Coordinates of C-alpha atoms and ligand atoms in Angstrom, one line a residue:
Chain A
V203 CA 13.0 6.9 -17.2
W204 CA 12.8 9.7 -19.8
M205 CA 14.9 9.8 -22.8
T206 CA 16.7 13.0 -23.9
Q207 CA 18.8 13.6 -27.1
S208 CA 20.4 16.9 -27.4
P209 CA 21.1 17.3 -31.0
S210 CA 18.0 18.6 -32.9
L211 CA 19.2 19.9 -36.4
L212 CA 23.0 19.0 -36.3
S213 CA 24.3 18.9 -40.1
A214 CA 27.7 18.6 -41.4
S215 CA 29.6 18.2 -44.6
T216 CA 30.5 14.9 -46.4
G217 CA 32.9 13.5 -44.2
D218 CA 33.3 14.5 -40.4
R219 CA 33.1 13.0 -36.8
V220 CA 29.7 13.8 -35.4
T221 CA 28.6 12.8 -31.7
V222 CA 24.9 12.4 -31.0
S223 CA 24.6 12.4 -27.3
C224 CA 21.7 10.8 -25.3
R225 CA 20.9 11.9 -21.8
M226 CA 19.0 9.9 -19.5
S227 CA 17.3 9.9 -16.0
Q228 CA 18.3 6.6 -14.3
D229 CA 21.0 4.1 -14.7
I230 CA 20.2 1.3 -17.0
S231 CA 23.8 -0.1 -17.5
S232 CA 24.0 -1.3 -21.1
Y233 CA 20.4 -1.6 -22.1
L234 CA 20.2 1.1 -24.7
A235 CA 19.8 0.7 -28.6
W236 CA 20.1 3.1 -31.5
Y237 CA 18.0 3.2 -34.7
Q238 CA 18.2 4.7 -38.2
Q239 CA 15.0 5.7 -40.1
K240 CA 15.3 7.0 -43.6
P241 CA 12.4 9.1 -44.7
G242 CA 9.3 7.1 -45.6
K243 CA 10.6 3.7 -44.6
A244 CA 10.7 1.4 -41.7
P245 CA 13.4 1.9 -39.3
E246 CA 16.4 -0.4 -39.5
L247 CA 18.2 -1.8 -36.3
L248 CA 21.4 -0.3 -35.6
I249 CA 24.0 -0.5 -32.5
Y250 CA 22.2 -2.3 -29.9
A251 CA 23.2 -2.9 -26.1
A252 CA 25.1 0.3 -26.7
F253 CA 28.1 -1.7 -27.7
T254 CA 27.4 -4.4 -30.3
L255 CA 27.2 -3.8 -34.0
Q256 CA 24.3 -5.3 -36.0
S257 CA 25.4 -7.8 -38.7
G258 CA 25.7 -6.0 -42.1
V259 CA 26.5 -2.4 -41.0
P260 CA 30.1 -1.1 -41.7
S261 CA 32.5 -0.3 -38.8
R262 CA 32.5 3.4 -39.3
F263 CA 29.3 3.4 -36.9
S264 CA 30.3 3.0 -32.9
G265 CA 28.7 3.3 -29.7
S266 CA 30.4 4.6 -26.5
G267 CA 29.6 5.9 -23.1
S268 CA 28.2 4.2 -20.0
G269 CA 26.0 4.9 -17.0
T270 CA 23.6 7.7 -17.9
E271 CA 25.2 9.0 -21.1
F272 CA 25.4 7.3 -24.4
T273 CA 26.8 8.6 -27.6
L274 CA 26.9 7.4 -31.3
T275 CA 30.1 8.4 -33.4
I276 CA 30.2 8.3 -37.1
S277 CA 33.8 8.0 -38.3
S278 CA 33.1 9.6 -41.7
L279 CA 30.0 11.0 -43.0
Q280 CA 28.8 9.6 -46.5
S281 CA 25.7 10.0 -48.7
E282 CA 24.3 6.9 -47.3
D283 CA 24.4 8.2 -43.5
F284 CA 21.8 11.0 -43.8
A285 CA 18.6 10.3 -41.7
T286 CA 17.3 10.2 -38.0
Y287 CA 18.8 8.4 -35.2
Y288 CA 16.6 7.3 -32.2
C289 CA 17.3 6.0 -28.8
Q290 CA 15.5 3.2 -27.0
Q291 CA 15.8 2.0 -23.4
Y292 CA 14.3 -1.4 -22.2
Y293 CA 15.1 -1.5 -18.6
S294 CA 11.5 -0.9 -17.1
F295 CA 8.6 -1.7 -19.1
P296 CA 7.6 1.6 -20.6
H297 CA 9.7 1.8 -23.8
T298 CA 10.6 5.6 -24.0
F299 CA 12.1 6.1 -27.5
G300 CA 14.0 9.4 -28.4
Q301 CA 13.0 12.4 -30.1
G302 CA 15.0 12.7 -33.2
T303 CA 18.4 13.7 -35.1
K304 CA 18.1 15.0 -38.5
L305 CA 21.6 15.0 -40.2
Chain B
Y100 CA 49.2 36.2 4.3
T101 CA 51.1 33.6 6.3
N102 CA 51.6 32.8 10.0
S103 CA 53.1 30.1 12.2
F104 CA 51.5 28.2 14.9
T105 CA 51.9 25.3 17.6
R106 CA 48.6 23.7 17.7
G107 CA 46.5 21.1 15.9
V108 CA 46.6 17.8 17.7
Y109 CA 43.5 15.5 17.8
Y110 CA 42.4 11.8 19.2
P111 CA 43.8 9.5 16.5
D112 CA 40.4 8.4 15.2
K113 CA 39.9 5.6 17.7
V114 CA 37.9 5.7 21.0
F115 CA 40.3 3.8 23.5
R116 CA 40.8 5.0 26.9
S117 CA 44.1 5.7 28.5
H118 CA 51.2 6.4 23.3
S119 CA 52.7 6.8 19.8
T120 CA 50.4 6.8 16.6
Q121 CA 51.1 7.2 13.0
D122 CA 48.3 8.9 11.5
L123 CA 47.4 12.1 9.4
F124 CA 48.4 15.1 11.7
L125 CA 49.5 18.7 11.4
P126 CA 53.1 19.7 11.8
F127 CA 53.8 22.0 14.6
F128 CA 55.8 25.1 13.2
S129 CA 54.1 25.0 9.8
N130 CA 52.9 28.0 7.6
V131 CA 49.2 28.6 7.9
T132 CA 47.7 30.7 5.1
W133 CA 46.2 33.7 7.0
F134 CA 43.0 34.8 5.4
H135 CA 40.3 37.7 5.6
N136 CA 36.6 33.4 0.1
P137 CA 38.5 31.7 -2.6
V138 CA 37.9 28.0 -3.5
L139 CA 40.8 26.4 -1.5
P140 CA 42.1 22.8 -2.4
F141 CA 41.4 20.1 0.1
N142 CA 44.5 17.9 -0.2
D143 CA 44.2 15.2 2.5
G144 CA 42.9 17.2 5.4
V145 CA 42.5 20.8 6.4
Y146 CA 42.8 22.3 9.9
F147 CA 40.2 25.1 9.9
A148 CA 40.2 27.7 12.7
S149 CA 38.1 30.9 13.2
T150 CA 37.9 33.8 15.6
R151 CA 28.9 29.9 9.0
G152 CA 29.2 27.0 6.6
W153 CA 31.4 25.2 4.1
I154 CA 30.9 23.6 0.8
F155 CA 32.6 20.3 0.1
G156 CA 32.9 18.7 -3.3
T157 CA 34.9 18.2 -6.5
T158 CA 33.4 20.0 -9.3
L159 CA 30.5 22.1 -7.2
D160 CA 28.2 21.1 -10.0
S161 CA 25.4 18.7 -10.7
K162 CA 27.9 16.3 -12.4
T163 CA 29.2 15.1 -9.0
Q164 CA 28.0 15.0 -5.5
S165 CA 28.8 17.7 -3.2
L166 CA 28.6 18.1 0.6
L167 CA 27.0 21.0 2.5
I168 CA 27.6 21.9 6.0
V169 CA 25.3 24.8 7.5
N170 CA 24.3 25.9 10.9
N171 CA 21.2 27.8 11.7
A172 CA 20.7 29.9 15.0
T173 CA 19.4 26.7 16.7
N174 CA 20.1 23.9 14.5
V175 CA 22.7 22.2 12.1
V176 CA 21.8 20.8 8.6
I177 CA 24.2 18.5 6.7
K178 CA 23.3 17.6 3.1
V179 CA 25.3 16.1 0.3
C180 CA 23.3 16.6 -3.0
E181 CA 23.9 17.7 -6.6
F182 CA 24.0 21.5 -5.8
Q183 CA 24.8 24.0 -8.4
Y184 CA 21.2 26.1 -2.9
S185 CA 19.9 27.0 -6.4
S186 CA 18.8 23.6 -7.3
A187 CA 18.6 20.6 -4.9
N188 CA 18.0 17.1 -6.3
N189 CA 18.2 13.4 -5.5
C190 CA 20.9 12.8 -2.8
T191 CA 20.9 10.0 0.0
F192 CA 22.0 11.6 3.3
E193 CA 20.5 14.3 5.8
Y194 CA 21.7 14.9 9.3
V195 CA 20.0 17.1 12.0
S196 CA 21.5 17.8 15.4
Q197 CA 22.4 20.6 18.0
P198 CA 24.4 23.2 16.0
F199 CA 28.3 23.4 16.2
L200 CA 38.0 30.7 18.9
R201 CA 36.3 27.9 17.1
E202 CA 38.5 25.3 15.2
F203 CA 37.8 22.2 13.3
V204 CA 39.6 19.2 11.6
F205 CA 38.1 17.7 8.4
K206 CA 39.4 14.4 7.0
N207 CA 37.9 12.1 4.4
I208 CA 39.3 8.5 4.6
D209 CA 37.8 4.9 4.0
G210 CA 34.5 6.5 2.7
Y211 CA 34.0 8.1 6.1
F212 CA 33.8 11.8 6.8
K213 CA 35.0 12.8 10.3
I214 CA 34.8 16.3 12.2
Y215 CA 36.6 17.3 15.3
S216 CA 36.0 20.5 17.2
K217 CA 37.0 22.6 20.4
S218 CA 43.8 21.6 22.5
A219 CA 42.9 17.9 22.0
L220 CA 40.1 18.5 19.6
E221 CA 37.5 15.9 20.6
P222 CA 35.6 13.8 18.2
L223 CA 32.3 15.5 17.2
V224 CA 30.4 13.4 14.5
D225 CA 31.2 10.7 11.9
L226 CA 29.5 10.4 8.7
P227 CA 29.4 7.5 6.3
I228 CA 29.1 9.8 3.1
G229 CA 31.2 7.7 0.8
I230 CA 32.1 10.4 -1.7
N231 CA 35.3 12.0 -3.0
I232 CA 36.4 15.8 -2.0
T233 CA 39.1 17.6 -3.4
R234 CA 38.1 21.3 -3.0
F235 CA 36.3 23.4 -0.7
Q236 CA 34.9 27.0 0.1
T237 CA 34.2 29.0 3.2
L238 CA 31.0 30.8 3.6
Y239 CA 40.1 32.4 9.5
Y240 CA 43.2 30.3 9.4
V241 CA 43.6 27.2 7.2
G242 CA 46.1 24.5 7.5
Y243 CA 47.0 21.4 5.6
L244 CA 47.3 17.8 7.4
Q245 CA 50.3 15.7 6.7
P246 CA 51.1 12.0 7.4
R247 CA 53.7 12.6 10.2
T248 CA 53.7 10.4 13.3
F249 CA 53.4 11.9 16.8
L250 CA 54.0 10.9 20.4
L251 CA 50.8 11.6 22.7
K252 CA 51.2 11.9 26.3
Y253 CA 47.4 11.3 27.8
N254 CA 46.7 12.7 31.3
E255 CA 45.2 9.7 32.9
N256 CA 41.7 10.5 32.1
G257 CA 42.2 10.9 28.4
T258 CA 42.6 14.9 27.8
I259 CA 45.5 14.9 25.6
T260 CA 47.9 17.7 26.7
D261 CA 51.2 17.6 25.1
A262 CA 52.4 16.2 21.7
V263 CA 55.8 15.4 20.1
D264 CA 56.6 15.4 16.4
Chain C
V118 CA 11.6 -13.5 -41.8
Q119 CA 9.4 -11.2 -43.7
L120 CA 6.7 -9.3 -41.8
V121 CA 3.6 -8.2 -43.4
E122 CA 0.7 -6.2 -42.1
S123 CA -2.9 -5.4 -43.3
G124 CA -6.1 -3.8 -42.0
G125 CA -6.8 -0.4 -40.8
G126 CA -7.9 2.4 -43.2
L127 CA -10.5 4.9 -43.2
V128 CA -12.6 4.5 -40.0
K129 CA -15.2 6.8 -38.2
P130 CA -14.2 8.1 -34.7
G131 CA -15.3 5.8 -31.9
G132 CA -15.1 2.7 -34.2
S133 CA -13.3 -0.5 -33.9
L134 CA -10.7 -2.0 -36.2
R135 CA -8.4 -5.1 -36.0
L136 CA -4.9 -5.3 -37.3
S137 CA -3.0 -8.4 -38.7
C138 CA 0.7 -9.1 -38.5
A139 CA 1.8 -12.2 -40.2
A140 CA 5.1 -14.3 -40.0
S141 CA 6.6 -15.8 -43.2
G142 CA 9.4 -18.0 -42.4
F143 CA 10.4 -18.0 -38.7
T144 CA 9.4 -19.5 -35.4
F145 CA 7.1 -16.8 -34.3
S146 CA 4.9 -19.0 -32.2
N147 CA 7.7 -18.9 -29.5
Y148 CA 9.0 -15.2 -30.2
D149 CA 7.5 -12.2 -28.7
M150 CA 5.9 -9.3 -30.5
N151 CA 5.6 -5.5 -30.1
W152 CA 3.8 -2.7 -31.7
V153 CA 5.3 0.8 -32.4
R154 CA 3.7 3.7 -34.1
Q155 CA 4.6 7.0 -35.5
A156 CA 2.7 10.0 -36.3
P157 CA 3.2 11.9 -39.6
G158 CA 6.4 14.1 -39.2
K159 CA 6.9 13.0 -35.8
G160 CA 9.0 10.3 -33.9
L161 CA 8.2 6.7 -32.7
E162 CA 6.1 6.1 -29.8
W163 CA 5.9 2.6 -28.0
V164 CA 2.2 1.0 -28.1
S165 CA 1.8 -2.5 -26.9
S166 CA 3.7 -5.8 -26.0
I167 CA 2.8 -9.4 -25.8
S168 CA 4.8 -12.5 -24.6
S169 CA 5.4 -15.7 -26.8
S170 CA 3.2 -17.6 -24.4
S171 CA 0.4 -15.0 -24.5
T172 CA 0.2 -14.9 -20.8
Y173 CA 1.9 -11.5 -19.9
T174 CA 0.8 -8.4 -21.8
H175 CA 1.9 -4.8 -21.2
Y176 CA 0.2 -1.6 -22.5
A177 CA 1.3 2.0 -22.8
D178 CA 0.2 4.8 -20.6
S179 CA -1.8 7.1 -22.7
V180 CA -3.7 4.3 -24.2
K181 CA -4.0 2.2 -21.1
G182 CA -7.3 0.2 -20.7
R183 CA -8.5 0.8 -24.3
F184 CA -6.5 -1.6 -26.4
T185 CA -6.5 -5.3 -26.7
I186 CA -3.5 -7.4 -28.0
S187 CA -3.8 -10.9 -29.0
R188 CA -2.1 -13.6 -31.1
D189 CA -2.8 -16.9 -32.9
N190 CA 0.5 -19.4 -32.7
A191 CA -1.4 -21.8 -35.1
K192 CA -1.6 -19.5 -38.1
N193 CA 1.4 -17.2 -37.2
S194 CA -0.9 -14.2 -37.0
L195 CA -1.0 -11.1 -34.5
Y196 CA -3.9 -8.8 -33.9
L197 CA -4.6 -5.7 -31.9
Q198 CA -8.2 -4.8 -31.1
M199 CA -8.7 -0.9 -30.8
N200 CA -11.9 0.9 -30.1
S201 CA -12.9 4.3 -29.0
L202 CA -10.5 5.8 -31.2
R203 CA -9.7 9.6 -31.2
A204 CA -8.1 12.0 -33.8
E205 CA -4.8 11.3 -32.0
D206 CA -4.4 7.7 -32.9
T207 CA -4.2 8.6 -36.6
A208 CA -0.8 7.4 -37.4
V209 CA 1.3 4.7 -39.0
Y210 CA 1.7 1.4 -37.0
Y211 CA 4.5 -1.1 -37.3
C212 CA 4.6 -4.6 -35.8
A213 CA 8.2 -5.3 -34.5
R214 CA 9.8 -8.8 -33.7
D215 CA 12.6 -9.4 -30.9
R216 CA 16.1 -10.3 -31.3
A217 CA 16.4 -13.2 -29.2
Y218 CA 14.6 -16.2 -27.3
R219 CA 13.8 -17.1 -23.8
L220 CA 12.8 -20.6 -22.7
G221 CA 11.3 -19.4 -19.5
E222 CA 8.4 -17.2 -19.8
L223 CA 9.0 -15.6 -16.3
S224 CA 7.4 -12.5 -15.0
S225 CA 9.4 -9.3 -15.3
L226 CA 12.1 -11.0 -17.4
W227 CA 10.8 -11.1 -20.9
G228 CA 10.9 -8.5 -23.5
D229 CA 14.3 -7.1 -23.0
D230 CA 15.3 -7.2 -26.8
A231 CA 16.0 -4.6 -29.3
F232 CA 13.3 -5.2 -32.2
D233 CA 15.6 -6.9 -34.6
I234 CA 13.3 -6.8 -37.6
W235 CA 10.2 -4.5 -38.4
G236 CA 7.3 -4.3 -40.8
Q237 CA 6.3 -2.1 -43.7
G238 CA 3.5 -0.1 -41.8
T239 CA 0.1 0.8 -42.6
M240 CA -2.0 4.0 -42.9
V241 CA -4.5 4.0 -39.8
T242 CA -6.6 7.1 -39.9
Chain D
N192 CA 15.4 -5.5 11.7
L193 CA 16.2 -8.0 8.9
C194 CA 18.9 -7.2 6.4
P195 CA 18.1 -6.6 2.7
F196 CA 20.2 -9.8 1.8
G197 CA 17.0 -11.2 0.4
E198 CA 17.0 -8.3 -2.3
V199 CA 20.7 -8.4 -3.0
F200 CA 20.7 -12.1 -4.0
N201 CA 17.2 -12.1 -5.5
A202 CA 17.5 -8.8 -7.4
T203 CA 15.8 -8.8 -11.0
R204 CA 19.2 -8.3 -12.8
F205 CA 22.8 -8.0 -12.1
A206 CA 25.3 -5.4 -13.5
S207 CA 28.1 -6.5 -15.9
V208 CA 31.5 -7.1 -14.6
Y209 CA 33.0 -3.6 -15.5
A210 CA 30.3 -1.7 -13.7
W211 CA 29.8 -4.0 -10.7
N212 CA 27.1 -2.7 -8.2
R213 CA 28.0 -2.0 -4.7
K214 CA 25.6 -1.7 -1.7
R215 CA 26.3 -0.5 1.8
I216 CA 24.8 -2.6 4.8
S217 CA 24.7 -1.2 8.3
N218 CA 22.5 -0.9 11.3
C219 CA 20.8 -4.2 10.8
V220 CA 20.7 -7.8 12.1
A221 CA 21.9 -10.2 9.6
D222 CA 20.8 -13.9 9.3
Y223 CA 23.2 -16.1 7.5
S224 CA 21.2 -19.4 8.1
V225 CA 19.4 -19.1 4.7
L226 CA 22.5 -18.6 2.9
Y227 CA 24.5 -21.5 3.9
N228 CA 21.5 -23.6 4.4
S229 CA 20.5 -23.7 0.8
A230 CA 21.5 -26.2 -2.1
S231 CA 21.2 -23.5 -4.7
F232 CA 24.7 -22.2 -4.0
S233 CA 27.3 -23.9 -6.2
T234 CA 30.2 -22.2 -4.6
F235 CA 30.2 -21.0 -1.0
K236 CA 33.9 -20.6 -0.2
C237 CA 35.4 -17.8 1.7
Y238 CA 38.6 -16.6 3.6
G239 CA 39.5 -15.8 7.2
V240 CA 35.9 -16.4 8.6
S241 CA 34.5 -20.0 9.0
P242 CA 30.8 -20.1 7.5
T243 CA 29.6 -21.6 10.8
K244 CA 31.2 -18.6 12.8
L245 CA 29.4 -16.0 10.8
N246 CA 26.3 -15.6 13.0
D247 CA 28.2 -15.2 16.3
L248 CA 30.0 -12.1 15.3
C249 CA 29.6 -8.3 15.0
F250 CA 30.8 -6.1 12.1
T251 CA 30.9 -2.4 11.6
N252 CA 30.4 -2.4 7.8
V253 CA 29.1 -4.9 5.4
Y254 CA 29.8 -4.4 1.5
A255 CA 28.0 -6.5 -1.0
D256 CA 29.0 -6.6 -4.7
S257 CA 27.4 -8.4 -7.5
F258 CA 28.2 -9.3 -11.3
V259 CA 27.8 -12.1 -13.7
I260 CA 30.8 -14.0 -15.0
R261 CA 31.3 -17.4 -16.9
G262 CA 31.5 -20.8 -15.1
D263 CA 35.4 -21.2 -15.6
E264 CA 36.0 -17.6 -14.2
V265 CA 34.7 -18.3 -10.8
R266 CA 38.0 -19.4 -9.5
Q267 CA 39.5 -16.1 -10.4
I268 CA 37.4 -14.2 -7.7
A269 CA 39.7 -14.9 -4.9
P270 CA 42.8 -13.1 -3.4
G271 CA 46.2 -13.6 -4.8
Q272 CA 45.0 -14.7 -8.2
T273 CA 46.1 -13.6 -11.6
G274 CA 44.0 -13.6 -14.9
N275 CA 42.0 -11.5 -17.3
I276 CA 39.2 -10.6 -14.8
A277 CA 41.3 -10.1 -11.9
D278 CA 44.0 -7.8 -13.4
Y279 CA 41.6 -5.9 -15.6
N280 CA 37.9 -6.1 -14.1
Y281 CA 37.7 -6.8 -10.5
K282 CA 40.6 -7.1 -8.0
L283 CA 40.5 -8.1 -4.2
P284 CA 43.2 -7.3 -1.8
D285 CA 45.3 -9.9 -0.3
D286 CA 44.0 -9.6 3.2
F287 CA 40.5 -10.0 2.2
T288 CA 37.9 -10.9 4.8
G289 CA 34.6 -11.7 3.3
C290 CA 32.7 -14.5 1.8
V291 CA 32.2 -15.2 -2.0
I292 CA 28.9 -16.8 -3.2
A293 CA 28.3 -17.8 -6.9
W294 CA 25.8 -20.1 -8.7
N295 CA 24.5 -21.1 -12.1
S296 CA 21.9 -18.8 -13.8
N297 CA 21.7 -20.4 -17.3
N298 CA 18.0 -20.6 -17.3
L299 CA 17.8 -16.7 -16.5
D300 CA 20.8 -14.8 -17.9
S301 CA 21.3 -16.8 -21.1
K302 CA 19.0 -16.5 -24.2
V303 CA 19.0 -18.2 -27.7
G304 CA 20.9 -16.0 -30.0
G305 CA 23.1 -14.3 -27.6
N306 CA 22.7 -12.3 -24.5
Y307 CA 24.9 -9.3 -25.5
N308 CA 24.2 -7.2 -22.5
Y309 CA 27.0 -8.6 -20.5
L310 CA 30.4 -7.1 -21.0
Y311 CA 34.0 -7.1 -19.6
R312 CA 37.0 -4.9 -20.0
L313 CA 39.9 -6.5 -21.8
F314 CA 42.6 -3.7 -22.7
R315 CA 44.1 -1.2 -19.9
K316 CA 47.3 0.4 -19.4
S317 CA 47.9 -0.9 -16.1
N318 CA 46.4 -3.2 -13.5
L319 CA 43.6 -2.3 -11.0
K320 CA 43.9 -1.3 -7.3
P321 CA 41.8 -3.5 -5.0
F322 CA 38.1 -2.5 -4.8
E323 CA 38.6 0.0 -7.7
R324 CA 36.5 0.1 -11.0
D325 CA 36.6 2.3 -14.0
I326 CA 33.6 2.5 -16.5
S327 CA 35.5 4.7 -19.0
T328 CA 35.1 3.3 -22.5
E329 CA 37.6 5.4 -24.4
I330 CA 39.2 3.8 -27.4
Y331 CA 42.3 1.9 -26.2
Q332 CA 45.8 3.0 -27.5
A333 CA 48.0 -0.1 -28.4
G334 CA 50.4 1.3 -31.1
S335 CA 52.4 4.3 -31.6
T336 CA 50.0 6.6 -33.6
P337 CA 47.3 8.1 -31.5
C338 CA 43.8 6.6 -32.2
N339 CA 41.7 9.8 -32.1
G340 CA 38.6 7.7 -31.8
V341 CA 38.7 5.6 -34.8
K342 CA 38.9 1.7 -34.5
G343 CA 41.7 0.1 -36.6
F344 CA 45.3 -0.9 -36.2
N345 CA 46.0 -1.3 -32.5
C346 CA 42.8 0.7 -31.7
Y347 CA 40.6 -2.2 -30.6
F348 CA 37.4 -1.6 -28.4
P349 CA 38.2 -2.2 -24.8
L350 CA 35.0 -4.1 -24.1
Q351 CA 33.7 -7.3 -25.6
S352 CA 30.6 -9.4 -25.1
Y353 CA 30.2 -12.8 -23.5
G354 CA 27.1 -13.8 -25.6
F355 CA 25.4 -16.5 -23.5
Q356 CA 23.5 -19.1 -25.3
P357 CA 22.1 -22.3 -23.9
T358 CA 24.1 -24.4 -26.3
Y359 CA 27.5 -24.1 -24.5
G360 CA 28.7 -26.3 -22.0
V361 CA 29.1 -25.6 -18.2
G362 CA 32.4 -23.9 -18.8
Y363 CA 30.8 -21.0 -20.6
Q364 CA 27.3 -20.9 -18.7
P365 CA 26.4 -17.7 -16.9
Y366 CA 27.1 -17.5 -13.3
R367 CA 26.0 -14.7 -10.9
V368 CA 28.6 -13.9 -8.2
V369 CA 28.1 -12.2 -4.8
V370 CA 31.1 -10.9 -2.9
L371 CA 30.5 -10.0 0.7
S372 CA 33.1 -8.3 2.7
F373 CA 33.6 -7.5 6.4
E374 CA 35.7 -5.1 8.4
Ligands
LIG84 C1 16.8 12.9 -9.5 O1 15.7 12.0 -9.3 C2 14.7 12.4 -10.4 C3 13.4 11.7 -10.0 O2 13.8 10.2 -10.2 C4 15.5 12.1 -11.7 O3 15.5 13.2 -12.5 C5 14.3 14.0 -12.8 O4 13.3 12.8 -12.9 C6 12.0 13.6 -13.2 C7 10.9 12.5 -13.1 O5 9.9 12.8 -12.1 C8 11.9 14.3 -14.4 O6 10.9 15.0 -14.7 C9 10.0 14.6 -15.7 O7 10.3 15.4 -17.0 C10 9.3 14.9 -18.1 C11 9.6 15.8 -19.2 O8 8.7 15.7 -20.3 C12 7.9 15.1 -17.7 O9 7.2 14.9 -18.9 C13 7.6 14.2 -16.6 O10 6.3 14.2 -16.1 C14 8.5 14.4 -15.3 O11 8.1 15.7 -14.7 C15 13.1 15.3 -14.5 O12 13.4 15.7 -15.8 C16 14.5 14.6 -14.1 N1 15.5 15.6 -14.0 C17 16.9 15.2 -14.2 C18 17.9 16.5 -14.2 O13 17.2 14.1 -14.5 C19 16.8 11.5 -11.5 O14 16.7 10.2 -10.9 C20 17.6 12.4 -10.5 N2 18.2 13.4 -11.3 C21 19.6 13.4 -11.7 C22 20.4 12.1 -11.1 O15 20.2 14.4 -12.2

């Protein structure tokens, strides 16, 4: 299994509907997570199992798609939501992370 | 162009020996699209006749599986892969056998793929492909099958001769 | 549920260092633990893993056969023995916990969590 | 030439209900002795074929499906049944000819804190045809105004998590279901 996001520099204005895709190789059903790492800080847990929301995050963050495709949709970009977003599968036991999406 | 015919009856998908059947058939005096290679739609079944291959699939892209039939000078190859062949990947089924007025009848039902050739087009091969097909292209007269019941008069050794709408 | 780390720092190539990842308020002794690193200006790459019972351990591919992971449930501490280092390994290392339990430490059934809480990192050179 | 029945029942993990796995079985010799003669099967009940008569027959195709459901929803995996899972997730034809197998898997599929990797479909426009599944996760439209992909008033997410923990009773404990079919 090899991870593949295909944004690499996507940047928008203050308030939009961006969609970061995450292509894969095999079928893992719903075993994919999402992260958000601000500069110079440890990553914070974001949507996990591709459909659940970690307690504390607002509802503007969503996770959709199934099979070998997964997308994270932001309802409205704000000043807080400007960082990188990674993928992580845990089907087999190499844990292949993503590449990075700088908003 | 268009043309009209009187042929296209095949053994109703079952292998008993000998009657009226209600299956997918071809109306007798129908309009056949005379041709001389556009990507035609599949509908439910096509009556293909000619006087050296076909591409079966939904999108003809790597997104969905597409079936491919090709005949060499001495061999026939059947593969259903994620074609674009520019790029062949993955896929589960490969078939090899002796290579196929040549006329055919293709139908896709119950996840099975059935081919008839030669009227009384005899069964040729059955494939458990298990994919959906909605469109095709020819690498000849093309008809379209319809669900109309026929009456088939066998000739005491099979060999269907006469059919009644 | 506050993870703190120590160790690492300046080291000569080919040397050996041992890191520490301590638990400060949860039931670490029956949670799993995982190690994730990132290079300066790069993404995250998986490194190591360990079960709660210390019976099953999985390592990465580019570092296979050179790292050793160990834990102590008595003092709630976690270690990673690294030796024969290169210039590639110079990076920041985080120790990552796991979201949920599993009573049965069964083969090929553990470590399917999503790294619920992380650490603050170090400056391994 | 033994069948891969051992692999289907002893798979490392089973897919969710809305994305049930389907495997084709053909050109093999099947042994049903180990299935019926096992006490681990909580429910071995089926329709149209007696379990003792299974080994004395021949079939042209064998289809095996698998998913994970709650304990109380096992009765819903049966022909001519109405409910949440039958109408929205997995529907069988009335003239079904195959054997349904289910058993408890609390020690495996349930973890403390919630195993949120198991899902089910809850909203749809219409009921499902037999042996038909849709993995589409588009946002559901329940009101008059189009949702346009934002959750809110009458725009709920069509999927929900079971969230297994070993604290619930037998009613909510995870069950693994295998639905064989013959034709
Ligand atoms: C068809 O099967 C292949 C193999 O399982 C899968 O897709 C391809 O998988 C190979 C893995 O051997 C990928 O190649 C890899 O690329 C990375 C890129 O860094 C490289 O480091 C690895 O050493 C390896 O060569 C390949 O990219 C991948 N291609 C695609 C299009 O996915 C997959 O199971 C099937 N492909 C489908 C369904 O499209």
